[PDB]
Design a protein around this ligand. Structure first.
Ligand code: ZN
Ligand code: ZN
Length: 72
């Protein structure tokens, strides 16, 4: 299971057991430019449904999980 947006995970990538999308998301969200906002809220729960409400919390969530694009 995806330990970010709490969905059926395809396989682990980077540092943690994530879905298919959280992989690609994270690699953009780290080594790229981002425009996700929960920089001064950080309220919403990111799961299988509510992740469409906010892709900002997902970055925070995956990081708490232990994601690292230079993990092992
Ligand atoms: Zn996910
Ligand atoms: Zn949010």
């Amino acid at each position: 299971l995806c330990l970010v947006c709490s969905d059926e995970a395809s396989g682990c990538h980077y540092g943690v057991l994530t879905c298919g999308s959280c992989k690609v998301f994270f690699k953009r969200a780290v080594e790229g430019q981002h425009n996700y906002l929960c920089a001064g809220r950080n309220d919403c729960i990111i799961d299988k449904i509510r992740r469409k409400n906010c892709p900002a919390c997902r970055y925070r969530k995956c990081l708490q999980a232990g994601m690292n694009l230079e993990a092992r």
